[PDB]
Each structure stands twice: as structure tokens, then as C-alpha cells.
Amino acid sequence: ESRDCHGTICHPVNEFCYVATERCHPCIEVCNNQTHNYDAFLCAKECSAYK
Amino acid sequence: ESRDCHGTICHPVNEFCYVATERCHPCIEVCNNQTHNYDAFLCAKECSAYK
Amino acid sequence: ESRDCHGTICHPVNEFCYVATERCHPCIEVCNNQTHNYDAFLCAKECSAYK
Amino acid sequence: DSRPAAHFHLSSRRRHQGSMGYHGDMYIGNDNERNSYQGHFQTRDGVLTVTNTGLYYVYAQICYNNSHDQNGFIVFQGDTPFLQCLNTVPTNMPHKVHTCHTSGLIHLERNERIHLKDIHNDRNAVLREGNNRSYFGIFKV
Amino acid sequence: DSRPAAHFHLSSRRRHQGSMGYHGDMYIGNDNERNSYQGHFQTRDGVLTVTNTGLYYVYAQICYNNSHDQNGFIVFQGDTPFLQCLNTVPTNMPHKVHTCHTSGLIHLERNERIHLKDIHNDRNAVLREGNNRSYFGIFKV
Amino acid sequence: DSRPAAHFHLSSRRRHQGSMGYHGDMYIGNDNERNSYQGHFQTRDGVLTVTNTGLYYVYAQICYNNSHDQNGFIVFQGDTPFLQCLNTVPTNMPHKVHTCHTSGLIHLERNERIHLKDIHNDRNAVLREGNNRSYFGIFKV
């Protein structure tokens, strides 16, 4: 599994390479149910190892 | 008076059908003096029964 | 030194005429290190008298 | 020499009551000094009238400078809302400045009209002579 | 009479799997009633195919109405992302509505294709018949 | 074959000092590989020079990716700010990405020039080869 996001290496479990920002993004922002940024598809596909 | 906002029925006194969001909107957001969203025209025309 | 920003006179030390807003702007917003709006070039060129 | 194309600097607004509950302020545009469209367009009270039927590309931009979370405007084809732009800028921060730009193709028949209206009333926007922040224009394709 | 120009009202979306990991939803556009481009364009499944090689100007706009901080879409030239629009609207406020508009020149050879896809999946956007908030169009220059 | 039309991928920026206190960074654009405008445009140091007088439609887009509340850029007609785009994205959230797009008609006489400059200095924006997030272009109407 490659965490290379435009040269920056994301955290192997807590981060993913977000297409919108082209930066490493915290998995908690898309995997948490209470937050307004919850995205089930992104959490399932980009943050499999999270939690 | 019709509170039908794209099929959703707004609260008869506390809500109005907001043209910008095409959703039911709280009257307090446009009728409160302290808030930065205060709109006297909208409050007068859309939220007559509020307060 | 002219603090005339579209007819509005800015505070001589604590404000500057911001090109983006065309309004008087607080120098602390661009001169403070902790804030996310810190701009060293703007602080140096627009807020020489600040602090 | 005249050509069906024009660029307008939005210089003022007028209160206006619409066909179907659209009571937002009507934006008024001043000609750019190099505009020349005699026999192709006619403009009165912020309404542009097309002389000959054709397919026209229109662009419109309003630069808002107020505290409200939601802002936007409408381009009307006759009395029908055709193009629209909307911005959401949250929080109570006083320094909110943002441009809202949209465009599209509008087939206009002879004597058909377009005009530009805000969604809200008494919303501060940048309006001035030779405006380089809020403008709108049209040209035949 | 037919002309290589068209305005499309974005009326629905479809799940779509792309060439290079672009799995965002594909936007589907309905013809404006005054469209007439027989022999210039062909449209199937949200993909527009160009009949003759030429230089085309394209504009695209999606009006988002969801809670997410980041939203955006892509205009594809073949299977290559060419034009893009992105908005950041922060805070957990429920009333987020904003249009994202972009445009550009795309040189298209004969039988080359363009299509419109969101960056995300299952993001609420304004999609309806005669849409005046999300639309996209094209005309030859 | 050459035509007065071009699409530019914004690939870098340069420090630049303007006529009237406009000291924002100058954006530099690379040709799209299908550009062909010999005898219609000339480009040096981010300044585009028009060969023949005419009415040109220009579009410009910068995709910002920084923490600042306010961002924007200017399209210059000669040394006069003509078109502008501005975005306000509040809060201290680190993940701010947004495109700012504007366009308009610019009547350019022979040897007149246009160029693209940011309002600020050292603001991070998306700049790269074959840029599909920040671009600008022009074509004669």
C-alpha cells in the first residue's frame, strides 16, 4: 500500500491521500459519525485500517 | 398560507421556505438583531408570525 | 501617510487599507504569528507602526 | 464598428418587482467605453433587449461584501430564471468579500430580453463606475 | 437549424467507474428545448462525442447543497482530467448552498469525447428538469 | 493551423512590481500542446501581447490551497485592473482548497497586452505542468 501523496508520506493508519486537497487527510474527519464531513464511501475505501 | 418548500412542510411559525437554499429555514436566523444574518426585509415578508 | 481607504480613515497604527476587502483591516490579523492569516509581507509593508 | 457583443460595468441597483415573486434588486450596468452594438442590443432600466434572433453567450459576476452567510443572483431569460450563482461564506467575521461568477448559452429570439437580479434585497455589493469586480456581458456565437 | 453549440440542464447522476481511479458520480444533462446540433454532437450516458475536429469552449457548473467542507467536479477530455472546480465551505452549518463554475478551451478531434464527473460519491447537488443551478454547455470557436 | 485562440496551463509564478502599487506575484502559463497561434499572440514573462486589434474573450482560474481567509487575482488590460476574482474561506482549518474563476470580454488594440497577477504575495496556489486546476485562456470573438 502506497501512502505517497505528491511526495508526502501519509500516516499508514490515521491518514489518506485526499483527492480534493491533494494532501494527506485525517481519517477521523471522514470516518466519524458525529462530524458533518462523514463520508462512508471514502472511509471504507481510503481508511480501511483506521479503527 | 402554504409552507410547502419543495415537498417539505416548514414549521408554521418558526420556519420559512428560503429561496437561496430551497429548504426550510429558521426564522430566528433572519429576525434576530445580534446575528450577522439579520435581514429585516426577509423577516418582515417571510416570518410574519414569528415572535 | 494617507490612511484614506475609499473615504474611510483607518486607525493610524492598528489598521491598514486592505486591497482585498477595500476596507480598513486590523493589523493584528496579518502581524500575529499564531493566526492562520499571518502575512509577513503585508505586515511589513502595510503595518510598519504596529507594535 | 458595431458588433453584437458588449461588456457592462455594474454601477448601481434599483428596487424591482418581478413576474413570479422575484423581488430582488435589479442590477444596472454601464457600457464599457469601447462598446459598440448599435442595431444589435437595446438597454433600458437594466433590461437588455436583443434585436435579432440568435444564440448568445452571457457571463455575469457580482462581488459581494456583506456579512450574510448566503448570497446570489439570477440571470433572467424573459421572466424565467435561467442562470444562477450562489455562495455560502459562514461565521460572523466582518471581512467577507467574494465574487460569484456564472455563464451559459441563451438562445434569444427577436425582441427577447435578459436582465440581472439579486436573490436578496439591500445586500451590499461592489457597484461603481468602471467596475472591475462586478460586471456582465454578452456576445453572439 | 443545427449548429455545433448546446446547453445542457444537469438532471441526474449515475454511478461510474473511470479509467484511472476516478470513481465519482457521472452527471447526466438534458437538452435545453432550443438545442439543435444534429451532426455536430452525440450524447449517450453523460458522454458527449464530437463529430468534427475543432476548438470548443466548454462551461460547467454544479450547485452543491450538502454539509461537506470540500466539494468539486471534473471535466474530462477523453479519460484525462482537463477542467476542474472546487469549493471549501467550512463549519457544521446545515445550510450550505454554493455553485462551482469553471470553463476553458478544449481542442477535440473527431470522435473525441468529454464528460462530467464529481470528485466524490453520493454528494447532494441540485439536479432537476430545466435545471437553472447546475448546467453545462459547449460551442465551437 | 494557427487561430487567435489559446489555452494556458499556469505552471509557475514570478515576483513582479506593477505600475500603480500592484506588487502581487505574476502568474506564468505554459502552452497546451495543441495551441497554435503564430501571428496572433506573443507571450513573454507572463505577458500576452495581441497582434491585431479585436474583441477577445478571456477566462482565468487560480486554485488556492493555503490557510488565508481572503485570496484573489487580477487580469490586467495593459496596466489597468479589468477582471477580478476573490474568495473568502474562513476559520483556521488547514484543508482549504478552492478555485477562483472569472471571465469577460476585453477589447484589445494592436500591440496591447494582458497579464495575470495575484492580489497577494507568496500565497500557495496549484501550479504545475499540464495544470488542470489553475489555467487561463483567450479567443477572439
Author numbering:
A (entry chain AAAA), B (entry chain AAAA), C (entry chain AAAA): 31 to 81
D (entry chain A), E (entry chain A), F (entry chain A): 275 to 415
Sentences from the paper on this structure:
Here we show that trimeric Egr ligands assemble in hetero-hexamers with both Grnd and Wgn, with Grnd displaying nanomolar binding affinity for Egr, which is 3-orders of magnitude higher than that for Wgn. Altogether, our data provide insight into ligand-mediated activation of Grnd and suggest that distinct affinities of TNF ligands for their receptors promote different and non-redundant cellular functions.
To shed light on the mechanism of Grnd activation by Egr, we set out to determine the crystallographic structure of the complex. To obtain diffraction-quality crystals, the Grnd30–97:Egr146–409 sample was subjected to limited proteolysis, yielding shorter constructs assigned by mass spectrometry to Egr269–409 and Grnd30–81, that still form complexes in solution according to SEC analysis. The final model includes residues 269–409 of Egr and amino acids 31–81 of Grnd. The architecture of the hetero-hexameric complex consists of a core Egr trimer bound to three Grnd-ECD copies positioned distally. No major conformational rearrangements of the Grnd fold can be observed upon binding to its ligand Egr (with a rmsd of 0.674 Å between the free and bound state), that associates as rigid bodies with no induced fit. The TNF domain of Egr adopts a typical “jelly-roll” fold, with an inner and an outer β-sheet composed of five antiparallel β-strands (conventionally named A’AHCF and B’BGDE, respectively). The interface between Egr and Grnd is organized in three surface patches.
